[PDB]
Amino acid sequence: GSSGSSGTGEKPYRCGECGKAFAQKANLTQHQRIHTGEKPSGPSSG
Numbered sequence: 001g002s003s004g005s006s007g008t009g010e011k012p013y014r015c016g017e018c019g020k021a022f023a024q025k026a027n028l029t030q031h032q033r034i035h036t037g038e039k040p041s042g043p044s045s046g
């Protein structure tokens with residue numbers, strides 16, 4: 001999935017666990033997953 005940089009302003013949505021932010025919820029909701037049960041491997045997806 002090769003895409004560019006979507007034109008989005010500030011981010012109204014701000015995570016509650018850490019305090020992150022995102023222009024769209026879909027981006028945040030998927031982020032919270034990082035907190036929900038910490039894995040041994042860790043968030044790398046490299």
Ligand SMILES: [Zn+2]
Nearest residue numbers: 015017018019
């Ligand atoms: Zn967070």
